[PDB]
Symmetry: D2
């Protein structure tokens, strides 16, 4: 439950864990000792993550960084640096320090090597991770990566997009993907291990034998999802719809509100861009009102791209349902997404699964390629 | 004044003038007094900007903000903040503080309202401000705004691209711009008021009357440029190329070295593979540091082009300095518009000789021209 | 916040290196605003534009301490037991020192600490009923006895109008004569000006931190209070658990002398362990090792899963832990004389984390004072209320 | 040489080089690798200290730290770290990082270990480094150190005190030290190698075989002092006096102004009523900006004492250069010990012409002299 946590310091600072490694790397780079054997510094950092893995409530990493997440695996940050260093030679610089984005690459690679025991579940944030904002799947190169990985693991698609239990509009969003599944996975027995998650934990779809997605009976997973009052989801939405009107009235912008079942959010109409900071304001506006009305149901409000949405689902709950349904632990569960800020919908997955922060679908092909290289 | 500001604080920290205003606005944000009449705070900020225009090296603003730019005009920051807030209502925010890009637009509007004495020269960075990087000018709304300004004052195009003294290749880069000039900027005497600067300050061009750009000779304006012989420019070309060859080997990049007269470059090729943004910063400082090792004082410029590196023996500030010496216009009535206003960019040296407007994409240039015409 | 068992559990376990880096989160919140106000040059003009809006959040935090904008900005705000008039506190403090005429030197942390104390004093418009004093370093130098006629005159006049107590950390088991020798000049002034009034019955002394209690006699002598009168208010602690705390602490004071080789000794008491330095033929112990050791003590106590109320603190040149804290001492006094929290104040010098008087901010108004010279300025302004 | 400027960012961080080491030591303390073999980091910092000694203008230490000074000697920062660590074990700390003041002891120890080549001139700030502010000399343990050090090198006392060229006034400050010289430093000729400087570079005294000071002839050393005429000394004295008269009114000070030939200051009334340290730091920058506004270029110094402020015609750096030219001593063989090395102190300009030990009490000076004698 991260609804209450939305500290001002938790917003202005980018990421507490990644900046923790940058500032240490900055001091190392400044001392002109970055290119020498820095395993003495990296291993002490590597040991700290281990101590946090064992005692996440009283480790020294907790005393330094107060708002750390929970580590599910032993992170070989020493091996992650050498592997990333020898490739790009980022250490060869003498005037440019390491960048936040580079340490995020090193942090992502450290969570991949920690899967030396294996990996059972792998989920993707279909939007901005597989294809740009709203575009359809057309990259045939990474479709081969997902098909080969499905033969040895479960593959799920968890996206905040909602189409209200209509397993036909999701076809056009993935038609090129299932086309590759019919050519390779249909003969194999792995096609039954591919699942599609709509809404954020409200619509689930499987995969038949003809490379098409179909709905799942509600009785097969209604018990796994902690159920929620019919009327409470309406109150959450009614609160938001009132908050967005104030936002559109408080800031004269060219957008309108869109209403759905168990999800709403404003979308700019023909489109005229809305300032990124305003959508940040609207998330904290909606959250503080949900806390005021003492609502405890799982919800989410994210600032993805140039459109704001509020779902009565949770991307972490969708990860929790599949783990409880497929009998998969958290240490053998991964997720790939882009909205990993405090106002993003992929951040809750840090509480129940390993995470990989990605900025563009190209980095996912770099992620999946390094996965099966083991 | 050689570029000696290759400091670690210059790379790590952002613009000193903008972040100075952001921190004050954040304290006005957390104090919950942002929405109330903050003119008492905004008037004192102007009081510092006025005194800095008089004593730039002894002002209280220089004591607070070091390495601060030079204000050629008195900046009306109180008006600019009022009119910006009315446009976008940034102040009504309760949980998001004023950001960096907003203050960039506020200082741009402040530097636009400062032109009460009149504008006499506009300069435009070609790539990334008039059209995307590596594109030809394809816009009719922008060319219509420029046509009206061309009758009021002189307009010039100062770019970093370089085709060796070929006016046919320059008109190809902005075809639809001369097309609009041929329809509305011929009957008036403004067609003799348009200029184009190739390289960075090495090739000068002008517009002939029959809808096509032509190249001006060298002997007419070479005396205004600083005298740098052909041997020194080639050593700058050589010590650079030796530094790039280190960068290709050091980081193993699929990058090519483009060599031309008075310019060295670093361009990749598709099998375009993207060089890492940070090795460009590292390679620029390597070339700048290597040049001053040999005690060179020739006006050069090494910059990062977002996706590539280029080192020109011309200075984008020299081009503005050349046109100021040709048209007999003081630095108070000269303005520049560019996207490379970081320490690694090439539009930054224009802070030393002209008013500067910071822009990130062509859509903001059109918004800057509309506001600059309602005067 | 919640009951005192919840706040003490977080105070001795939820510390952070970032939080311990900044002395106070609330005072630093005002320094950044005044810094930008000083940097914006607009500080010397009429800044009621900005100050009034700071009060607005201070009032909103008094009515809603858990979901206020002040709790959004500062994550670890305490709980305001009253409405702080920071606008009048700024005007009154500035009209005296005129710190706003400075052009090249911003306001400092210690100055905003003074203004915040004056704001907490002006907030006692509803009256005051209890006033407690950290004895050492606020009533007299560290380790000294009471010796200030100006301070005795202020406490005596306040004693006739309200109850007076002294919460210290010095732990003499039950020898009131040893406490009397520390304040003999204070009871001497009380004998000449307070026996005529019935105010000497309103004077109390708290030995250790909430472990021993004494009251003043009609003969100006200090006497022990019967334990059957107040032992029930204190949260009881098992004799096995207290010796568990003293032993687990005593072990680290040997490890800190082995790591750092200090010429220091370890004093062990019932419900008290100490780390004192040796004489010169007094040796000086570094301040950071003392801060380091307190974190070591606190870190080790939670590792052994002890949840009893304790207080590891830094005494400038000393390091002690006591089974009990000053917040428990205030609770017992508040339960004894039936006094609401809003009409109780406490003056001390150790208001940092790993400090002595820090738990007081959870159940009373607090004044952060550096030396007895500053203590007079607090009581002199307190007498100016009526 | 000229006295440089300052920024508000530079006034906050007392010493950039010390602060440059704390942030590195913090991340070492933060990485959990502080107590391990960190020699690889210590040797690399030395590599920058060495490369800055050989090439002070273009070094990576100059690129990282802008306001870095001139290293007259190679600084062995690695051995100074182990030596200070083995004494206090500040590295075994698990929850408190190394502090600013501990690195000061390390930088002082690193500058002491750099004197393996030898010393030729030792200089002491009399006030606050030899005795408390305004007290006569009274220590035999420190007198034995100065006496034993007067044998091997020249020792001078450079203090901002100013008694009008009469040795008796200065002697009352150094009475117990001179009586120790008669017992130990008269049988040889070591008393002839002792010097005392009244003011920053105005008054000079030598020791006599009777353990007594005498004013040296002005003709024997005044040619090294950069001449400053009566009109220029009085303009600094007046421009200062006007600043203090406003500082008294602005803050309602209970203080007075004292005027001397070549000197002026602000002292509190006798009662010794405390005067705020902040308004003292404010009066420095008030006068310093006012002096540069009137284009004054004479050597001057406005410093902030413990309980008072003073402005003197001359700086301790020029006083050192007088003695360096007097006894023909090279720069790399000079050393100085002072208490106020902040940007508003009389001992800061020493960094431009000598090595420096930064202390804060006479007990730390003994720790410096004991470590110096044990080489
Ligand atoms: O309720 C929904 N209905 C339709 N689209 C949505 C809904 N919620 C989010 N979206 C959009 O669909 C995408 C889902 O975000 P994701 O978590 O990155 O996949 C984003 O582009 C959202 O703006
Ligand atoms: O000398 C040149 N020859 C060819 N291309 C260049 C040359 N110099 C710069 N460029 C490229 O053209 C762009 C023009 O930059 P701009 O016009 O300053 O925005 C640069 O960013 C480079 O990509
Ligand atoms: O339990 C104890 N018994 C005796 N002396 C103590 C004890 N605890 C702390 N001290 C010392 O007595 C001082 C009194 O602390 P204070 O009165 O809380 O300021 C401390 O700063 C320590 O030097
Ligand atoms: O010119 C002066 N005449 C008399 N006393 C002075 C003069 N200048 C400074 N002082 C005092 O002597 C002290 C010398 O400090 P020092 O610079 O550390 O030697 C100052 O802090 C003042 O108290
Ligand atoms: Mg996404
Ligand atoms: Mg550009
Ligand atoms: Mg105390
Ligand atoms: Mg001194």
């Amino acid at each position: 439950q991260w609804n209450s946590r939305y500290s001002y310091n938790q917003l202005k600072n980018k990421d507490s864990l990644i900046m923790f490694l940058v500032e240490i790397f900055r001091s190392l780079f400044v001392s002109n000792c970055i290119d020498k054997n820095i395993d003495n510094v990296l291993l002490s950092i590597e040991e700290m993550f281990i101590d946090h893995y064992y005692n996440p409530q009283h480790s020294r990493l907790k005393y330094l960084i107060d708002d750390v997440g929970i580590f599910f695996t032993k992170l070989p940050i020493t091996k992650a640096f050498h592997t990333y260093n020898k490739k790009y030679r980022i250490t060869k610089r003498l005037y440019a320090p390491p960048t936040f984005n580079e340490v995020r690459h090193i942090l992502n690679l450290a969570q991949i090597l920690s899967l030396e025991e294996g990996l059972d579940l792998l989920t993707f944030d279909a939007n901005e991770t597989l294809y740009p904002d709203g575009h359809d799947f057309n990259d045939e190169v990474l479709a081969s990566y997902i098909s080969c990985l499905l033969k040895k693991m479960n593959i799920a698609i968890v996206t905040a997009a909602s189409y209200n239990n209509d397993a036909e509009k999701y076809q056009k969003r993935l038609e090129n993907l299932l086309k590759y599944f019919s050519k390779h996975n249909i003969k194999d027995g792995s096609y039954k291990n591919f699942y599609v998650m709509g809404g954020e934990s409200n619509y689930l779809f499987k995969c038949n034998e003809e490379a098409t997605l179909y709905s799942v009976p509600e009785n097969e997973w209604r018990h796994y999802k902690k159920f929620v009052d019919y009327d409470t989801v309406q109150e959450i939405l009614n609160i938001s719809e009132k908050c967005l009107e104030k936002v559109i009235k408080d800031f004269g912008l060219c957008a309108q509100i869109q209403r759905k079942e168990k999800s709403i959010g404003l979308v700019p109409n023909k489109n005229y861009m809305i300032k990124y900071e305003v959508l940040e304001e609207a998330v904290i506006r909606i959250k503080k009102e949900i806390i005021k009305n003492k609502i405890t149901a799982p919800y989410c409000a994210f600032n993805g791209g140039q459109d704001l949405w509020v779902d009565v689902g949770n991307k972490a709950e969708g990860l929790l349902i599949l783990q409880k349904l497929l009998k998969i632990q958290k240490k053998k569960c991964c997720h790939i997404g882009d909205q990993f800020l405090h106002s993003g919908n992929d951040f809750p997955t840090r509480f129940c699964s390993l995470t990989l922060w990605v900025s563009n679908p190209q980095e996912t092909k770099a992620c999946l390629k390094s996965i099966m290289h083991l």
